DNA sequence: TTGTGGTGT
C-alpha cells in the first residue's frame, strides 16, 4: 500500500460540518411514489391491459373528416398541380406495385419491402397506404409513422413528400426529431421521425396504440434502435392484431429480416440509378501502370487468385498485386496518381476518395495541395480539393456540395462519412481504398481500441452508388477481387459493440424486467457478459438495487435522454445548484465537442482550447466556458466572427444549448427544479465554485480515475485505477501540461490507438472523490491513519475528519434516496439545504489561493 | 503529440 496526500480538515471546519449535519438530521405530495410503486406492483399481463385504456384515441373515427378528405382527394386529382406529379410519381418503380403492396398489408401483419436507392420506397410506400385509406373513406383511421436512422433524412424526406403533395409541411406530412418537429395533423397523416424518438414514445405508449402503420426504414444498417425495435415488436405484435408493420431494407442480408419475422412476404423493387462500372486493383494498375517504392499471410491470399486470371492481365500487373502494399491506402502516392489519371482521361465529374481517417486524409491532401511530383504540379491549380471529416468544417459549409469553378475538377478526400450521412450529388468517380477505422471493445481487458480495418462488402456496395447519382460513374476499388471474397458481409451490428446500461434500464420502463431473456431474442444477441456488466454498472450507481429491480433514482434516470451516469450527474447538479455548467459538460459528452480541427491548424487549435479552459485543467468545464463565450457573442452580435476566430461550429453550439434546455425542462417537470431555465439564478448559486463543479463532474464520471506521478511540454507517468498506463489524448487540454494542483483526474472515455489515451478529463480532488464515490473506509495501514476511496487510492487522514466524512456520506445517501422518492427542489433555507452547505464547505478547502 | 459514424416525446 502507497499513501497519498493529507485530506484532514481544520477543527473550525469539522466543527461547522458537524453543526450542519445535526440541523439536517433534525428534520421530520408524491404522485411519483405512487407511480413508482404502481410500476413495480403490476405483472406484464396487467401492464398490457392498463396501457390499452389510456391510449384509446384511435378507437375513435370522424366520418365527417373521412368523407371530407375522400372528397378533396378525388377533387384535387383533376387539378393541374397534380396529375403531372401523379404522373412523374408513376415513373418510380415502387408505384408499379402499389396495389400489390396494399393487398400484402391487408392480408399480413408484417411484410418486408426490399429495394435500393431510387426505387422510391421511402417516399412512396407511406403515400400509397395513406391515399388508399383516404380513398376508401377511412382517412381518420390512418396514422402512419416512418422511422429513419438519421435526423437529416427525416426532415428532407418529409419536406420532399410534402412538396409531392402540393402542401406545406405540417399538414398530411410532418417530421419529429429530437428537439425539433413540424408535426403533421392528428389523423390521415404521415410522420417521419428518427428511430430514437419512436423508442422514447414507447414509455407513454408501449404497445403502439397511437399509430395504425409502423414503417422501419434502413433496418439493414443494423442501428441499435432498429434492432431493438424489431425485438420489441415480437413482444408487442401478439397484443396488437390490427397493427400493420412494413419493414424496409436495402438488398443487404435482406433474408435475415424475412427470416426473423416468420417467413413473411417480401417485395423486391428494382432500382433507379446510373450504372457505376466496378473496377478492382488489377483493373487500376492495368490502366495507370503505377510503380511502387519509397506479414505474408498476404502471399497466401493473393497467389491462388493470380492463377485463375493469369491470361486476363499482364504479368507485371499480376506481379504488383503480390505486393502487400498494393492494396488499401498504404501508398498514398498511388492514390494520388489515380486522381491525376482521372483528371487526364475521363469526362468531367467529381472524385470522392474514401480513406480511413484524419491521418490519411491529411497525407493525400498535402500531396495533392503541395505536390512534389511534376504531374501533380501540372494538375494542382486545376483541382478544387475538399477534405471531408466529421471534425472538419467543410461538411457544415456550402462549398463541397456545389459544382466547382469552370476548368476545375472537384476532388473530395473523405472518411466513411460520405458513405451515407453526407452526400455530394455531382460525384461521378469513387476511389474506394477499402480501409476504414473501427471501434472495438474487448470485454475481457476493458480496453476500447480504434483500429484500421478492411471495409465490408456492404460498405463497398454503398460507396459504388455514390458515383451513380447524376450520370454513369466509375468506382475504383484499391483492393484485389480476392480480398473482396475475404471481406465480411456487413459490419458487426452496432449492438454487439455497445454499452448496454442505457438499454437495460430503458427496458424496465417498458416492463421488460429480464434483459438476458429479452436481449437474447434479437437478430444478434449481445454477449451476456456485456449484459451482466451493464447491470453491475446500474447497481453501482444505485439505479437498480441488489436484486436488480428499478430504484426510484433509476426510474428518473430511465426517463432522461442521456446515459444513466450523466443523468445522475445532472440530477446532482440540480440538488447542488450548478445546473448550467454541469449540463454543458453532460451535453458535450453525450453529443460532441464544438471545436473543429481543421487541417494544419492543429496547434492554433490547441492554443484556443487551452485559452477557453481558463487554466481550470478540465476538458468539460472548458466546453461550458465556450458556451458562456458563445452566448455573450450573440448578445454582442459578434457571433460569426467569434466562431471563426476560435474554430467553433455554431451548428454544434446551438445544439448543445438545445440539449441543455431539454434537461432543464425535464428536471423542472420532474420537480427537481423551480425553474426550467438552465441559466436561472436559483439553480446556479453554486455554478461559480469550481471545486464544487469538479466534485459533481466526478460524481458522474466515477469510477473512471487516473493518478499522475511524473514531470518534465511535459511528460506524464499516469495510470488508471486498474493499474494500466495512460496519457491524455493530445487533443485534451491536459496534454503536455505541468503544474497541476492535483494528481487525480476523472475521464469519460479511454481509447487505445498508438497509446492508451484519456480522450477527455477533469482534474479532481481526493476529498470530492471520497464524498461522492464508494469503497470508502477509515483505518491505519502502517502507523498512519488513512481514508480511502474505491479501495484503491489511500489518503492520509486524521480520525476526526474520517469520522465526519463518513457520517457525511451516510447523510448524503439518505438525502438522495429521499429526493428520488419525493422529488421537490431543495428549499433555500430548509433542513436539506444545511447538508448541501456542509458539503460546499468541505469541498471549498481545495480552492486555489 | 492525435481524432470511423449515428442518435434520444
TrEMBL record:
GO function terms (MF aspect): ATP binding; DNA helicase activity; G-quadruplex DNA binding; G-quadruplex RNA binding; hydrolase activity; RNA helicase activity
InterPro entries, alphabetized: DEAD-box_helicase_OB_fold, DEAD/DEAH_box_helicase_dom, DNA/RNA_helicase_DEAH_CS, HA2_WH, Helicase-assoc_dom, Helicase_ATP-bd, Helicase_C-like, P-loop_NTPase
Transmembrane segments: none
Entry keywords, A to Z: ATP-binding, Helicase, Hydrolase, Nucleotide-binding, RNA-binding
RNA-binding found in the keyword field: yes
Origin superkingdom: Eukaryota
Coiled coil start-end: none
Pfam families reported in the protein's UniProt record: DEAD, HA2_C, Helicase_C, OB_NTP_bind, WHD_HA2
GO terms under biological process: DNA geometric change
Helicase C-terminal domain segment(s): 334-511
Keyword Nucleotide-binding set for record: yes
Listed EC numbers: 3.6.4.13
Residue ranges of domain Helicase ATP-binding in the record: 102-270
Top-level enzyme category: hydrolase
CC terms in the record's Gene Ontology section: cytoplasm; nucleus
Full protein name: RNA helicase
Species: Drosophila melanogaster (Fruit fly)
